[PDB]
Structures are given as C-alpha cells and as structure tokens.
Design a protein around this ligand. Structure first.
Ligand SMILES: C[C@](O[C@@H]1CC(C(=O)O)=C[C@@H](OP(=O)(O)O)[C@H]1O)(C(=O)O)P(=O)(O)O
Length: 427
C-alpha cells in the first residue's frame, strides 16, 4: 500500500490555477463527439476520468488530438449518434460521467455494445437510467447484477414519454437530456419525485446550449425535448476550472490562511460547487469573487448545520474543515454520498473519528464534533479521490497525517498534492 505523509502546514497562501472541470470536460467531450464540426476544447482536465472518456471515444471511432499537457483537445465531430455494432465491449475504466452519458447516447439507433469498466464501476447504480431509457424504447440487458453495469445496449431509444427517478442521482437525467435531442421523436422527460444534485442539471443544460441545443425546462419537474436535433461544434470551448477541486484550496485558506486564490472559475461559473464558497463564508471565512477567480481569506471557523444536497461533493470538504470549526457541524440530505466512489458517509465518519472527532453517521447526514486537538491517523481512502483530498486538510494543524493511496486523487486531480504544497507556507 502506497502512502503519502503530510507534515503540519503552518499557513496556506497563494494562487492556484485550477485543473479543468471534470463535469464540464466529459460533457464537452461527448457533445463534441456527437456534434458536427471540429470542437477545440481548452483547459480540458487531464485526469483518469477524462482519459477514460477519451479512451472510450477512441474505441467508438472518434478522432481527436491532444496538446502536450493534454489540456487542449481537437475533436472531429461524428455528426450524429455514434454507431457501434458487433456486441463489442466498451471499457470505461472508472468514469461514471462516461458510463452514465454513454449508456444513454449509445441507445440511439441500432447499436449492440456492452458497457463496462473496472470492477468498482459495476458497484455504481444505473437502474434508474436504464428504466428511463427503456421507456423511451431502448433495449437494455443487465449482464450481471440487476440495476448496475455491465450493460448490453441494443439500441431503440426513439423518444416519447419518459419518466426518470431523480432521487438518487442527477446523472441519469443528465444522460437522458444529452441523448434525447438526437432521438427521432420528441421526448417528454418527467421527474418521478425529488431531484438531487440539481446544479449538475444546469451544467448539462449549459453545455447542451453551447453545442446548439436547448430544451424546455418546466421547473425541473419535466423537460420537453424536441427530437431530430443535431449538436453543432461551438468552435473553441473553454472548460471552466474545477469548482469541486477548488474547494480543498479555498477550505485550506479558511482553515489556515492567509489568502488562497483559485483561478479558472469566478462569479459567472456554471458549476454548483462554487456555492461551496458561500458555506465557508457562513462559517466565518472571507470570500472574494472575481470574473475568473474566487479567493478565500482566513477569518474564523464556526460550525454550521445545512442541507448540502446542492453541493454533495464539495460538502465532503466541509466535513473535514469542520474539524477546525467551533461547535458541531451537521451536513444534511447527502444520502447519495453512499452510492459514489465509496460510501462516503461511512468512510467520512470512520476516518474523521480516527483523527479524534466524535461523529454521528446518520442515514443521510453527518454530525461532526471536533476534538480539542487532532491526533495522527493513517487515513484510509477507499479508492476515493475525494477522501484523499478532504483528509489532506488534517495537516493544517499541529499533527501530520498519512494518506493511503494518494494517487487515487488522479481520478480528477493528478497534481493535487503538489498544488497543495504550492500554497503550503512554512512561514
Ligand atoms: C460522484 C462523482 O461526481 C459526480 C459528477 C456529476 C456530473 O454529472 O458531472 C454529478 C454528481 O453526481 P450525483 O450527486 O448527481 O449522483 C457528482 O457527485 C463522479 O463523477 O463520480 P465524484 O464525486 O467521484 O467526482
């Protein structure tokens, strides 16, 4: 087992040029592949999630070229639905933002392809999306456990009246939204009940409009999509820096700054995780908003009790930042923490307790009572990039912390530790 030990960081201060948004990157890649024309993505994220998406596009016959730092990508649009026959296997590694969207997109036409990935991918639910796709005409077969990948897609999604459960993941709706415009018939996507991670739907809609497609959003309860559309290359597209990745650095400043400025995202960003800054502000930190930056300056840190359903990922960062806040922090309505890279509620509670916190792992919430002082712990990361990044913040104290499998950050942020070190100051 590989590990990285972070020595206590006395102060953080500096500027970080954010890696590209993983959410935006994979949506842009898929739309670029389906679109007509050449799309040039800039500030594209170079991480495992994107590499796996790129690998899948290659397997699907899409042509593209990458710059040296793999942040600039020129994609030759397919000019319509990707075609894949022969019941071949499409390996998506561990990119859920590839698996979900492609599961839907490859249901267009008369394909026959099997989607799978690393063993862990088979543990992320996709049943709600399959249910919706089938209502739209798609022929889908679970090759292993019902409601999970691998899936054998045999086309048939034509559109029509489609219900979709949006209570476990916004990604199923996202996948349906990107695929539907290309279906031959108009589609009416009806959300069964609650819709979690709503901000991600806005990212999806934003990307779709950029690629030439708009739909009718009826208060996020139903989405009317006209079929027979085509995605069009927007020419050059700038990928916003990753707001989720930015949370770690902004939190670092709220805890041990100094002022940390992240560039690549600003007040105009489409990502819901920029709202993470509001939480730090509510906790006592100072936030500065720029056109292409967000900065956080140390103030004080006070515990908060909030519904974090709008920023599920960035919320994990608040969970460890809570170790440094005064009082008990409660993060509510984060049930789907349980169905991601690992069960994050279980994982976060387990590791937080290891560094000294008293933690109540609620079914869909977490209450964190910080200790008077943190203690050393060899943090288990559960093959989850965010566990590694969240716990790196434990080093912003008097105790060092050992992070197991530090390379797991590569899913979305390969250079995480060097970047953290960049803003880590001894004086
Ligand atoms: C889970 C994860 O990131 C997810 C990416 C995502 C998207 O549409 O881009 C929506 C969210 O999922 P949900 O809350 O709607 O299910 C994020 O949590 C991803 O791609 O795995 P990450 O947190 O591991 O980066």
């Amino acid at each position: 087992m590989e590990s990285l030990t972070l020595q206590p960081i006395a102060r953080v201060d500096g500027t970080i040029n954010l890696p590209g948004s993983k959410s935006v990157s994979n949506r842009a890649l898929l739309l670029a592949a389906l679109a007509h024309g050449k799309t040039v993505l800039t500030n594209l994220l170079d991480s495992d999630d994107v590499r796996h998406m790129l690998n899948a596009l290659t397997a699907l016959g899409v042509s593209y070229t990458l710059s040296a730092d793999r942040t600039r990508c020129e994609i030759i649009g397919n000019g319509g639905p990707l075609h894949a026959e022969g019941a071949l296997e499409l390996f998506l590694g561990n990119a859920g933002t590839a698996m979900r969207p492609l599961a839907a997109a490859l249901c267009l036409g008369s394909n026959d392809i099997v989607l799978t990935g690393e063993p862990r991918m088979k543990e992320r639910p996709i049943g709600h999306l399959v249910d919706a796709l089938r209502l739209g005409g798609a022929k889908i077969t679970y090759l292993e456990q019902e409601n999970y990948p691998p899936l054998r897609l045999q086309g048939g999604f034509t559109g029509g009246n489609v219900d979709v459960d949006g209570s476990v993941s916004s990604q199923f709706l996202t996948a349906l939204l990107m695929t539907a415009p290309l279906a031959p018939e108009d589609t009416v996507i009806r959300i069964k009940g609650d819709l979690v991670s709503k901000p991600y739907i806005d990212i999806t809609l934003n990307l779709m409009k950029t690629f030439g497609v708009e739909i009718e959003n009826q208060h996020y309860q139903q989405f009317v999509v006209k079929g027979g559309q085509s995605y069009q290359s927007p020419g050059t597209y700038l990928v916003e820096g990753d707001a989720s990745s930015a949370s770690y650095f902004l939190a670092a400043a709220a805890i041990k700054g100094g002022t940390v400025k992240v560039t690549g995202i600003g007040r105009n960003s489409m990502q819901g995780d920029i709202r993470f800054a509001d939480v730090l502000e509510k906790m006592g930190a100072t936030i500065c908003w720029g056109d292409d930056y967000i900065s956080c300056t140390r103030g004080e840190l006070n515990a908060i009790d909030m519904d974090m359903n709008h920023i599920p990922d960035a919320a994990m960062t608040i969970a460890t930042a809570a170790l440094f806040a005064k009082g008990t922090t409660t993060l509510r309505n984060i049930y789907n923490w349980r169905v991601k890279e690992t069960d994050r509620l279980f994982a976060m509670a387990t590791e937080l307790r290891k560094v000294g916190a008293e933690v109540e792992e609620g079914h869909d919430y977490i209450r964190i009572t910080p200790p008077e002082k943190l203690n050393f712990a060899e943090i288990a990361t559960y093959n989850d990039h965010r566990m590694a990044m969240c716990f790196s913040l434990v080093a912003l104290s008097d105790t060092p912390v050992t992070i197991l499998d530090p390379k797991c950050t590569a899913k979305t942020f390969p250079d995480y530790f060097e970047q953290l070190a960049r803003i880590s100051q001894a004086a």
